[PDB]
Design a protein around this ligand. Structure first.
Ligand SMILES: [Zn+2]
Lengths: 286, 53, 287, 54
């Protein structure tokens, strides 16, 4: 149904507010906020959101506390001031997906339309993208397990339309723009290996752990496609790609001729002014 | 004075040597600021505009 | 009779709420309320900022519904927002950020409770996207016309308050109407969450997806940009063939504002993408 | 092909861009279109007709 979503940083800075207005009480649980957006178009666009007092139990996980009057009053006043945005779903700040999320999401599945779920981290130490759109749809399983709520990952992007780019750029004054060239390219080409190294290294350890020490079926069926796609590149002998290395290396030669020739053109004004300026300033100095 | 010029001059050796990485920092940072302000004054020029004579 | 040097603390909450409220800043007059806590005399901090529904009357004391204001404030009191109102904001599109008689009258009526009564006017309509410089307004006492206008100490920040130096509004209407300085604040959670959030907003999902796209587009699409780049290079070299004649005749003074050097340097920078991504293809092919 | 010149009824002329939703079919010149006050975007076009042709 929905291919991609658009999440503005305003809601995540509202999660920064979720971490600001705590008051140093010692709970810092998965505070659930009421996510708002535009479900009209096929693409999802989050503009702003708000929160609702949400408290769980220490031992029992099935305890969840929501509010209908606060949702209808905040949504009623927010719709009165801005009727272009309506309820879409919710989101929790907890890093782990608990079992009670089917009951928490089920309320906004009954009263509200199909709600999207977003799992983020309480500490911004994760290098990866903090936002993951998880659609709440029921899928048929091939093994015969009963139909249950399934959270499929929907791709997400963090973009701002008109003003939030200007506000973020003014508040930071440290981040740089695209700036194609040497630095913005070589930084990605340096740290990209760590950007994949922390992800893959962080995933395959618990993966290999759950291979031998795993039960409660984790959908082993998708592991066959996992190792299949991993074995779709069986160390090609590079025999056919030699001519492609001749093509890319020939373009490299083109960059060599462009650099040497163009820089040789740049040497004109320098290697002329260095003489005509020094000898004339010297002969005319005294 | 004759032999003291060596060790006294070493302080000038260090004071002039310390400026190398400093001018490296200035020449590597002020051009980053040059492209920052350059793109900042470049992005002011927007396509929607009025045409005069 | 005493005055200090006050400064308005502006976080990203009120800023982004004034940016979404500026996107909703239609020509019709809008209303808003600022909240916060008063810790001492010469400091003021804003935390909570929301919008108000529009009305046909516009900015006025009659449009402010006390049961709606107190209702939403009470709903903020039952939640984790124990902050009292500190001021009200609005938008003045087109005719400038100055305040009319109605605005100064509802400001005079709304300043009876809070002695500070911070007033902010956002106007992103005619302001370019390069700067988001915003200014906070204040109300002066009418009985201070005999004595000095603003006996504010620490006159250093007035140089930073001199950035809005429009020659009609500031000193064109500065009588009985002055302003105050604005500073910001950012903790480590906003710095790392918003910084990594913006870097990720300019980065990819797995960060390895769109690299090979350009690494392999260098052979398909960039070749056209390389041929056209050489067409501009030769298109300048055809004049650089004529340059050594003038440079061989006059050698005195410069009449052409074109440098012919930095543009070719930029062409070399765009041409170095092949070199920088060749090692990327070497890594993808290797492992 | 992406950004062209518009001629307003009031007399002053402007230049606008292309919206990601519409295509280059109706974007060809000679067709009266509509603009927006903010960002000068294009929502849809305006088909001509005689005041009297209706
Ligand atoms: Zn007005």
């Amino acid at each position: 149904a929905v291919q991609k979503v658009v999440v503005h940083p305003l809601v995540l800075l509202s999660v920064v507010d979720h971490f600001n207005r705590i008051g140093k009480v010692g709970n810092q649980k998965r505070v659930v906020g009421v996510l708002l957006g535009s479900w009209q178009k096929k693409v999802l666009d989050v503009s702003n959101s708000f929160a609702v007092p949400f408290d769980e139990d220490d031992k029992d996980d099935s305890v969840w506390f929501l509010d209908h009057d606060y949702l209808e009053n905040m949504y009623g006043m927010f719709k009165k001031v801005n009727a272009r945005e309506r309820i879409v779903g919710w989101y929790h700040t907890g890093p782990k997906l608990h079992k009670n999320d089917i009951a928490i999401n089920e309320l906004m599945k009954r009263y509200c339309p199909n709600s999207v779920l977003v799992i983020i981290d309480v500490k911004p130490k994760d290098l990866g993208l903090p936002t993951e759109a998880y659609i709440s749809v029921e899928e048929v399983h091939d093994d015969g397990t009963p139909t249950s709520k399934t959270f499929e990952h929907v791709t997400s992007e963090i973009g701002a339309e008109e003003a939030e780019e200007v506000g973020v750029e003014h508040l930071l004054r440290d981040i740089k723009d695209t700036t194609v060239g040497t630095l913005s390219q070589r930084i990605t080409n340096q740290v990209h290996g760590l950007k994949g190294l922390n992800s893959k290294l962080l995933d395959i350890r618990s993966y290999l752990e759950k291979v031998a020490t795993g039960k409660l079926p984790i959908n082993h069926q998708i592991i066959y496609q996992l190792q299949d796609v991993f074995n779709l590149l069986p160390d090609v002998s590079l025999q056919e790609f030699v001519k492609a290395f001749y093509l890319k290396t020939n373009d490299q030669m083109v960059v060599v001729y462009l650099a040497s020739l163009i820089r040789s053109v740049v040497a004109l004004h320098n290697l002329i002014n260095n003489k005509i300026a020094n000898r004339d300033a010297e002969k005319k100095e005294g | 004075d004759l032999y003291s010029r060596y060790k006294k001059l070493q302080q000038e050796l260090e004071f002039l040597e310390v400026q190398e990485e400093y001018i490296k920092d200035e020449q590597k940072n002020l051009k980053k600021e040059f492209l920052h302000a350059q793109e900042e004054v470049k992005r002011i020029q927007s396509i929607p505009l009025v045409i005069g004579q | 009779a005493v005055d200090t040097a006050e400064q308005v603390y502006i976080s990203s909450l009120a800023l982004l709420k004034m940016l979404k409220h500026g996107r909703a800043g239609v020509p019709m007059e809008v209303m808003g309320l600022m909240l916060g806590e008063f810790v001492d005399d010469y400091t003021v901090r804003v935390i909570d900022v929301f919008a108000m529904p529009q009305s046909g009357t516009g900015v006025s004391v009659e449009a402010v519904d006390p049961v709606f204001q107190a209702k939403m404030l009470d709903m903020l009191k039952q939640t984790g927002r124990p902050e009292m109102v500190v001021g009200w904001y609005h938008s003045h599109p087109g005719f400038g950020c100055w305040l009319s008689g109605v605005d100064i009258n509802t400001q005079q009526s709304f300043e009876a409770l809070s002695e500070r009564a911070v007033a902010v006017v956002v106007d992103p309509i005619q302001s370019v996207k390069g700067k988001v410089v915003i200014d906070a307004f204040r109300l002066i006492n009418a009985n201070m016309m005999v004595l000095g206008h603003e006996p504010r100490q620490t006159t250093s920040n007035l140089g930073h308050l001199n950035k809005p130096s429009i020659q009609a509004l500031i000193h064109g209407l500065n009588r009985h109407y002055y302003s105050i300085t604005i500073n910001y604040r950012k903790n480590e959670l906003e710095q790392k969450m918003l910084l990594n959030l913006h870097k990720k907003s300019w980065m990819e999902g797995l960060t390895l997806q769109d690299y090979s796209e350009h690494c392999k587009h260098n052979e398909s699409v960039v070749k056209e940009m390389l041929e056209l780049a050489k067409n501009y290079n030769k298109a300048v070299e055809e004049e650089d063939k004529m340059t050594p004649e003038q440079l061989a005749i006059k050698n005195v003074g410069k009449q052409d504002p074109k440098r012919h050097l930095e543009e070719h340097v930029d062409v070399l920078m765009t041409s170095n993408i092949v070199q920088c991504l060749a090692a990327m293809l070497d890594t993808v092919v290797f492992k | 092909e992406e950004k062209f010149i518009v001629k307003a009824t009031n007399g002053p002329r402007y230049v606008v861009g292309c919206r990601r939703q519409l295509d280059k079919s109706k974007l060809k010149p000679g067709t009266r279109v509509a603009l927006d006050m903010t960002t000068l975007t294009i929502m849809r076009y305006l088909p001509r007709e005689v005041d009297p042709l209706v």
